[PDB]
Amino acid sequence: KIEAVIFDWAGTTVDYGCFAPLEVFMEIFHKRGVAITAEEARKPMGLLKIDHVRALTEMPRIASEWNRVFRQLPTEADIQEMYEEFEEILFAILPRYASPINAVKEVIASLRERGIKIGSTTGYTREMMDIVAKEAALQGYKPDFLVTPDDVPAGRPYPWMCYKNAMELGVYPMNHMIKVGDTVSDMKEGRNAGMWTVGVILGSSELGLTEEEVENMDSVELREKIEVVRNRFVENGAHFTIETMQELESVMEHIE
Amino acid sequence: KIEAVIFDWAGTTVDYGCFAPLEVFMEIFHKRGVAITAEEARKPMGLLKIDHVRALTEMPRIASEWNRVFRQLPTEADIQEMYEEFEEILFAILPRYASPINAVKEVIASLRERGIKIGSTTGYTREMMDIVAKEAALQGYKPDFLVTPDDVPAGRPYPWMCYKNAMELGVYPMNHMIKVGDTVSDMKEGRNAGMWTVGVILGSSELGLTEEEVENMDSVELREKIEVVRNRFVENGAHFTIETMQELESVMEHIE
Ligand SMILES: [Mg+2]
Ligand SMILES: [Mg+2]
């Protein structure tokens, strides 16, 4: 079994902690006087950027807090406007948060050795990826194929992007594919796609941590946190959790 | 739970017995003083209309009468000339075979009442499906979505055409979908698609009869004749087999 692996981008292979979009989601909302936590603004991470914005205006607190200031819930105009602001800020600093996360490369290197194809589903737009891919390639990492919510009719909770990878790589049986990701969104996407869903933790968005505070964080603590991210993935569709790409192969191994 | 049903065209919903092509081939060869029969025409089943002429070209008996005529043996030219003097003849007589099979119209309505999105895949090229379809619609039959080998890379044996219906009808698990067909290769497409596969028999193709050797074929013979088709099916990978489109809902029911 297993003829192909499909990787999330920002959080699984590139951008540790998935930080590019973070402050921005918070920024646009703060200019309106709403203010949300780095937590909420990271719940629906995985979705098509605009959907991600739309989801933020829909959470009760946010959606309520909003009403308390404008005396009415958020309009398309608003969100549509908020996205336009997001679109240019994120677009400007997007080049930085783009270097591959410490580990992957060797793993892909290994995976391609046993003749395994590498696909790639993502939350960024086509216009965005153009960027993230060039530099990500320049730093070594060029999956065999890339899909975006533009290529298909719908965002990410749907398998749609995955199908296009399978169609492109040329692997028939949906259950001959591993889906590695770092968010709740991916879990579903993998399960809905009918694939083996693996979910990395350290570097993920879930855990949501950099380094000078993971590699410089108190044992228990961190272990206690990994343990919180691990459950979320499992209790959200996920057949296996991992603490990093090094442990991936072994999972494939066990899928026998 | 069964959410969608991908129906095949010729043999399943239109052209009872699938005779559209059978006549064209017998026709193109007739011209070139090379008489071929209904079985030794049917015999090289499925394949790409082009590579079919190719097959028929290698039928010992055909390659022998051919050489008796032109004193050579078919060439890359002849094949082309043939697959070309094929399409035009098809386009010209194809509407006579886009008449919905007695049964199917009345059944689609019933799935429709249950909220089951209707899809379909095929072998006929877009150039042809457009014709066949247009007539079919004009006669009360029109699936929610259509797909031709052209809509995707590789042809039929692969799951690509189902992955695209699913994507368009909007149904998640491939296994919340039933694929109904009238051929061996039709079963493969479903299994590979990873969806419950069903085979319809009296609509021929694998059977090869018409209403005058079915509607009037002797009992002990028709049956002895049916069982063989039912077996070829079960062998090539179908989960179920129904003598008619009617049972289809009893099966969807059994599957639940
Ligand atoms: Mg991520
Ligand atoms: Mg057929």
- Ordered DSSP codes for B144-166: S----TTTSSS-SSSSHHHHHHI
CA distance B193 to chain A (A): 7
- Residue A166, annotated as binding a ligand: no
Alpha carbon distance A214, A216 (integer Å): 5
Contact between chains at A173 and B160 (C-beta distance less than 8 A) = no
Report how many Cβ contacts below 8 Å link chain A to chain B: 31
The C-alpha atoms of residue A155 and residue A185 are separated, in whole angstroms, by: 10
Indicate the SS3 state at residue B100: strand
The answer to whether A1 contacts chain B (CB < 8 Å) is no
Sequence-distant contacts of A88-93: CB under 8 A, at least 24 apart: A89/A24, A89/A27, A89/A28, A90/A20, A90/A21, A90/A24, A90/A49, A90/A128, A91/A127, A91/A128, A91/A131, A93/A20
The DSSP H or E segment spanning B7 is: strand B4-7
Question: How many C-beta atoms lie closer than 10 Å to residue A180's C-beta?
Answer: 24
Whether B199 contacts B182, CB under 8 Å = yes
Distance of alpha carbon B74 from alpha carbon B91, whole angstroms:
25
Q: Is the separation of the CB atoms in A180 and A200 below 8 Å?
A: yes
- Cross-chain CB nearest to A194 (options B152, B164, B194): B194
Containing A253, the helix (H) or strand (E) segment is helix A248-254
Which chain A residues are within 8 Å of B194, Cβ to Cβ?
173-175, 194
Q: Which ligand is nearest to the CA of A21?
A: 1
Residues 6+ apart with CB under 8 A from B2: B116, B176, B177, B178, B196, B252, B255, B256
Angle at B244 between CA B145 and CA B129, to 5 degrees: 30
- Helix orientation angle between A49-56 and A76-93, rounded to the nearest 10 degrees: 130
Compute the distance between CA of residue B3 and CA of residue A132 in angstroms, rounded to an integer: 38
Helix, strand, or coil (residue B109)? helix
**Which one of the listed residues A8, A15, A51, A186 is annotated catalytic?**
A8
State how far the Cα of B107 lies from the Cα of B105, in Å rounded to an integer.
5
For A246, half-sphere exposure in the C-beta direction (CA atoms, 13 angstrom radius) is 6
Q: What is the DSSP-derived secondary structure letter of residue A14?
A: B
- CATH for A1-19+98-256 is 3.40.50.1000
Chain B contact present for A163, CB below 8 A: yes
A127-152 burial, b if ≥16 CB within 10 A, otherwise e? ebbeebbebbeeeebebbbbbbbeeb
Assigned token pair, A101: 């996360």
Q: Which two tokens stand for residue B231?
A: 């077996």
> For B122, how many CA atoms within 13 A lie in the half-sphere containing its CB?
26
CA distance B181 to B207: 12
Residue in A closest to B151 by C-alpha: A167
Q: Is B190 helix (H, G, I), strand (E, B) or coil?
A: helix
Q: Is A15 left (phi over 0), alpha (psi -120 to 50) or beta?
A: left
Contact between chains at B152 and A167 (C-beta distance less than 8 A): yes
Name every chain A residue with its beta carbon within 8 A of the beta carbon of B166.
163
What is the distance in angstroms between the Cα of B163 and the nearest Cα belonging to chain A? 6
Q: Is A83 on the interface with B (CB under 8 A)?
A: no
Contact A163 B164 (CB under 8 A): yes
Helix axes B126-138, B76-93, angle to 10 degrees: 20
Experimental technique, in short, is X-ray
Nearest chain A CA: its distance from B48 CA (Å): 20
Which of A15, A43, A49, A186 is the catalytic position? A49
Give every CB contact of residue A25 below 8 A, 6+ residues apart in sequence.
A36, A41, A42, A52, A53, A56, A86
Contact criterion met (CB below 8 Å) for B166 and B197: no
CATH of B20-97, one of 3.40.50.150, 3.40.1190.10, 1.10.150.240, 1.10.10.10: 1.10.150.240
Residue where the block lists tokens 């089943």:
B45
Q: Could you tell me if residue A141 is left (phi over 0), alpha (psi between -120 and 50 degrees) or otherwise beta?
A: left
Backbone torsions φ then ψ of B133, nearest 5 degrees = -55, -65
Distance of CA B36 to CAs B24, B64, B65, B66, Å?
11, 11, 9, 10
Distance CA B24, CA B39 (A): 14
A150 and chain B in contact, CB less than 8 A = no
B155 in contact with A, Cβ within 8 Å = no
B-chain CB neighbours of A160 within 8 Å are: 167
Give me the DSSP letters along A157-225.
SSTHHHHHHHHHHT--SGGGEEEEESSHHHHHHHHHHTSEEEEE-TTSTTTT--STTTTSS-HHHHHHH
Backbone φ and ψ of B13, nearest 5°: -120, -20
How many CA atoms, within 13 angstroms, populate the side-chain half-sphere of residue A199?
Answer: 31
- Give whole-number Cα distances, B75 to A250, B63, B67, B72, B86, in Å: 54, 11, 11, 9, 16
Q: How far is CA A67 from CA A64, A77, A85, in A?
A: 5, 15, 21
Taking each helix axis as running N to C, give the angle between helix A184-193 and helix A219-234, from 0 to 180 degrees, rounded to the nearest 10.
30
Which DSSP string corresponds to B203-250?
Answer: TBSSS---TTSSTTS-HHHHHHHHHHHHHHHHHTT-SEEESSTTTHHH
| Binding-site entries of B | 8, 10, 182
Q: How far apart are CA A117 and CA A126, in angstroms?
A: 22
Q: Is B165 on the interface with A (CB under 8 A)?
A: no
Does residue A8 have an active-site annotation? yes
CA of B193 to the centre of ligand 1 (A): 29
Tell whether A152 lies on the interface with B, counting CB pairs under 8 A. yes
Residues 6+ apart with CB under 8 A from B208: B17, B18, B38, B42
Question: Which one, of B243, B240, B178, lies nearest residue B206 by Cα?
Answer: B243
Report phi then psi at A108, rounded to 5: -65, -45
What six digits make up the tokens of B111? 């799935």
Other CB atoms within a 10 A radius of the CB of residue A58 amount to 13
Which of B153, B172, B173 lies nearest to residue A167, judging by beta carbons? Answer: B153
Instruction: Identify the residue among A167, A169, A171, A191 best suited for mutation to test binding to B, counting B beta carbons within 10 A and taking the highest.
Output: A167
Boundaries of every domain in chain A: 1-19+98-256, 20-97
User: How many Å apart are CA A29 and CA A41, to the nearest integer?
Assistant: 10
Does residue A110 belong to the interface with chain B, where contact is any CB pair within 8 Å? no
Residues of B in contact with A166 (CB under 8 A): 163
Using alpha carbons only, how large is chain B's radius of gyration in Å? 19
Q: Are B14 and B98 in contact (CB under 8 A)?
A: yes
Handedness of CA A66, A67, A73, A76 (dihedral sign): negative
- Tell me the structure's resolution in angstroms, rounded to a single decimal: 3.0
Q: Which amino acid is at A202?
A: L
